[PDB]
Amino acid sequence: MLQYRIIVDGRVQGVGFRYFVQMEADKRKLAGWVKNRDDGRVEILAEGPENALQSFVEAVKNGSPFSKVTDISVTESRSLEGHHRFSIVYS
Structure with a gap:
């Protein structure tokens, strides 16, 4: 497990x-x-x-097929969210 x-x-x-x-x-x-x-x-x-998670970086760094990522940055963390779902947020 990681974050x-x-x-x-x-x-x-x-x-x-x-x-x-x-x-x-x-x-x-x-x-x-x-x-x-x-x-x-x-x-x-x-x-x-x-x-x-690494597979999800491979998804994210592609963008959608419609998108184009031109730069990306990552920080691993070990200070868990403890969440139970994924969400779309705007806070």
Whole structure:
């Protein structure tokens, strides 16, 4: 088990990307959130099996097929969310 926070940049809005990320977390039953940042970036935060999490980075770094990620940043964490679902957030 592990946890991370990820920040993403590119054409990652107006392409449904937060829903792409939502479904790509759900297809591994990961827990955490995805949100837009008012700065213009997007953010992911997840917890789950570290193989499933790495596979979720492989999903995220692609963007949706409609998107294009042009830069991405990652921080692993060990200060668990303890969540039981994935969510779309805007806080």
